[PDB]
């Protein structure tokens, strides 16, 4: 009974990559030819924000790109100014390790979780002046890795339980389930209609899933390691995604097979967070090395270097406007980065 | 600039404020000890805790001990795939290792070996060091004396084991005891020795699970840790 | 993708050599270091033996060495198991698992319930 099912499920498979390599005739390398090299990317730090005491872990921008939320594994959740430099807010958490910050795009709650298993959503509005916990979502049974607001109703979390799920902060349910990983799930990308979502998990699979009705739509094995961080190309169509072999790779929906890797014969150490450029030109990966690094997405070449971490680089984000990029370490410092 | 001046004067008394704050909370945190308690769930970890006090996935302990403050966690509602976890201890004072010195399901010891191996060797907790607990000590002393065990077919090497010079057996102890017990903690050391390179440092203890010198052991070995720190910051060591 | 495949077991005969191999696909072998574990009927996942990523460095449960060994061929990214002189507690499926992360020494999970990088197993029985 389940020998037979298996010798099929392995002949779905053969079909599948089958399909792949029927799909697969030019490669995106050969197509980006003709295009011309970004040249050097020389990006200098412009701010220095201190007042983590332990390493900071997880990082969000805000839909205004210029206040940013941080996580830090002391059992502090700290709002900056990246302009001034200026705190705005300081919130400390019921348990210190903190594992994922999330913004709402509103701009009037922050998210947060980690090894308690627990989402707790912070109003920021304060109608009576303090920030208090407005609500703590519970259901998970692994740990929350990451967790990234729909809108002020509704939440997407990613956790250790090998399972993401759609929450109702109004009601504090879970809205839907999404399961279908084997591993640990890390990481988890919001498309840009919020209409589905990505996630890699330890099992070295990214998996795309629709977010109103609940199942997974399309399951993508490229890399040979577990998957750290993972993000969306700008336009939705496509994503990239980095892991523990010390490779990035990009992966497009609509093909639904891997396009480029992006890699080097002297890197041999894993990819902690990924993010996009705003045009999509530019991927940025932070590395467990101490300095993170920009490749350009289309030519697979390393186009710059960012080297300012005295630890590995846990978070990494890019505004949504595009002018500056924020990048966290174990080192406890947060630094924004501009072009010259 | 007349509408503006007022709303920076605020921001930077806020932070002001958020900076006293966080200048007496860096304070508090500097003060205290935070130790990762790990095990299985057939060891002693459970008794060892709750003898210590005296859903969620994460457990919390706070002991003092002569005025010094001790924050040891405890793994919850988690699954058995540390890799991912086990980085966001690699801050901690110590890693309290607790180990059944029992070898039946299977050879658990050998999976302990195995664990306290992918412990040591990790790059994240290559600076951490692991306090360990042979934990059990009555199972060891009332199974080797009843007349057969599951330690000398399992470790063929125990045979050729003569008990270390250095061993500083109980008084009123079997020779044969005191033999498996030093046995199974060179067992730990083989291995904690061959990579420590003088980043991090292991403690062995035989304990019992049960009596009031465990928290004073970690408390020791909390403040040898602290000590040779602050001798490496001066290239003492 | 990431797949490994197990083939050999079957049933043998108390005191036999029996031999197990082990295909790799979707991964460097070179660069990981991997490892045989079993599972007993009715126990739970035990770990038998490792070898490291150039085949230098090899260890065994204590129940074994003396008897079984390994070796792994990067030429053909094929990893060995012989297990001469077989006893009758020797009864299990073995899974050929690979190390989660390359370029490491410390190498966490291998026996776990839902591991992911683990083949499915052949079964090997002795018995008369």
């Known amino acids: 009974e389940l020998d037979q099912l298996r010798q099929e499920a392995e002949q779905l498979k053969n079909q599948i990559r089958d399909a792949r390599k029927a799909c697969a005739d030019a490669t995106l390398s050969q197509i980006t030819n003709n295009i011309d090299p970004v040249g050097r990317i020389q990006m200098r730090t412009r701010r220095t924000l201190r007042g983590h005491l332990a390493k900071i872990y997880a990082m969000h921008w805000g839909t205004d790109s210029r206040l940013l939320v941080s996580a830090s594994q002391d059992g502090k959740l700290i709002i900056w100014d990246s302009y001034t430099t200026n705190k705005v807010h300081a919130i400390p958490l019921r348990s210190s390790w903190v594992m994922t910050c999330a913004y709402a795009p509103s701009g009037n709650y922050v998210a947060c979780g980690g090894l308690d298993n627990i989402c707790s959503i912070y109003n920021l509005k304060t109608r009576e002046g303090n920030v208090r916990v407005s609500r703590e979502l519970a259901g998970h049974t692994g740990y929350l890795s990451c967790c990234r607001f729909l809108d002020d109703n509704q939440i997407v979390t990613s956790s250790g339980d090998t399972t993401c799920a759609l929450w109702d902060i109004e009601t504090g349910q879970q809205t839907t389930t999404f399961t279908g990983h084997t591993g640990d799930v890390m990481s988890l990308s919001l498309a840009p209609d919020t209409r589905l979502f990505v996630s890699g998990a330890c099992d070295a699979s990214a998996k795309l899933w629709d977010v109103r009705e609940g199942m997974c739509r399309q399951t993508f094995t490229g890399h040979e390691s577990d998957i750290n961080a993972i993000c969306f190309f700008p336009n939705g169509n496509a994503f990239a995604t980095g892991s523990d072999d010390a490779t990035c790779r990009l992966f497009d929906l609509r093909a639904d097979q891997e396009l480029m890797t992006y890699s080097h014969d002297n890197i041999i150490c894993g990819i902690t967070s990924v993010s996009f450029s705003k045009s999509g030109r530019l991927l940025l990966a932070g590395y467990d090395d101490f300095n993170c690094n920009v490749w350009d997405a289309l030519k697979a070449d390393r186009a710059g270097v960012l080297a300012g971490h005295d630890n590995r680089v846990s978070c990494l984000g890019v505004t949504d406007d595009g002018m500056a990029v924020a990048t966290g370490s174990w080192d406890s410092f947060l630094k924004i980065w501009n072009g010259s | 600039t007349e509408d503006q001046r007022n709303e920076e004067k605020a921001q930077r008394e806020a932070n002001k404020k958020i900076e006293k704050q966080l200048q007496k909370d860096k304070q508090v945190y500097r003060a205290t000890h935070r130790l990762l308690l790990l095990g299985a769930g057939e060891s002693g970890k459970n008794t060892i805790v709750k003898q210590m006090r005296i859903t969620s996935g994460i457990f919390e302990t706070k002991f003092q001990v002569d005025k010094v403050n001790f924050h040891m966690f405890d793994v919850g509602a988690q699954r058995d795939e540390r890799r991912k976890w086990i980085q966001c201890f690699n801050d901690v004072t110590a890693i309290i290792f607790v180990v059944a010195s029992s070898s039946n399901q299977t050879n658990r010891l050998q999976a302990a070996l195995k664990l306290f191996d992918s412990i040591w060797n990790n790059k994240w907790l290559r600076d951490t060091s692991v306090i360990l607990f042979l934990n059990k000590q009555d199972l060891l002393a009332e199974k080797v004396l009843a007349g057969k065990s599951k330690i000398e077919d399992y470790f063929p090497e125990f045979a050729r084991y003569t008990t270390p010079e250095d061993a500083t057996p109980e008084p009123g102890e079997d020779p044969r005891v005191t033999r498996a017990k030093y046995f199974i903690r060179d067992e730990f050391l083989r291995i904690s020795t061959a990579s420590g390179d003088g980043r991090h440092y292991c403690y062995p203890h035989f304990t019992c699970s049960v009596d009031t010198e465990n928290i004073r052991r970690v408390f020791n070995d909390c403040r040898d840790i602290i000590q040779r720190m602050h001798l490496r910051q001066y290239e003492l060591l | 993708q990431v797949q490994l495949q197990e083939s050999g077991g079957g049933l043998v005969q108390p005191g036999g050599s029996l031999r197990l191999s082990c295909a790799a696909s979707?991964?460097?072998?070179?660069?990981?270091?991997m490892n045989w574990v079993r599972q007993a009927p009715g126990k739970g996942l035990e770990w038998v033996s490792d070898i490291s990523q150039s085949g230098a460095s090899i260890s065994y449960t204590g129940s074994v060495k003396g008897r079984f060994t390994i070796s792994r061929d990067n030429a053909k990214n094929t990893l060995y198991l012989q297990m001469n002189s077989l006893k009758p507690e020797d009864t299990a499926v073995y899974y050929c698992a690979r190390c989660p992360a390359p370029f490491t020494r410390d190498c966490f999970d291998v026996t776990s319930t839902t591991y992911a990088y683990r083949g499915q197993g052949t079964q090997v029985t002795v018995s008369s």
């Open positions: 979707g991964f460097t072998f070179s660069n990981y270091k």
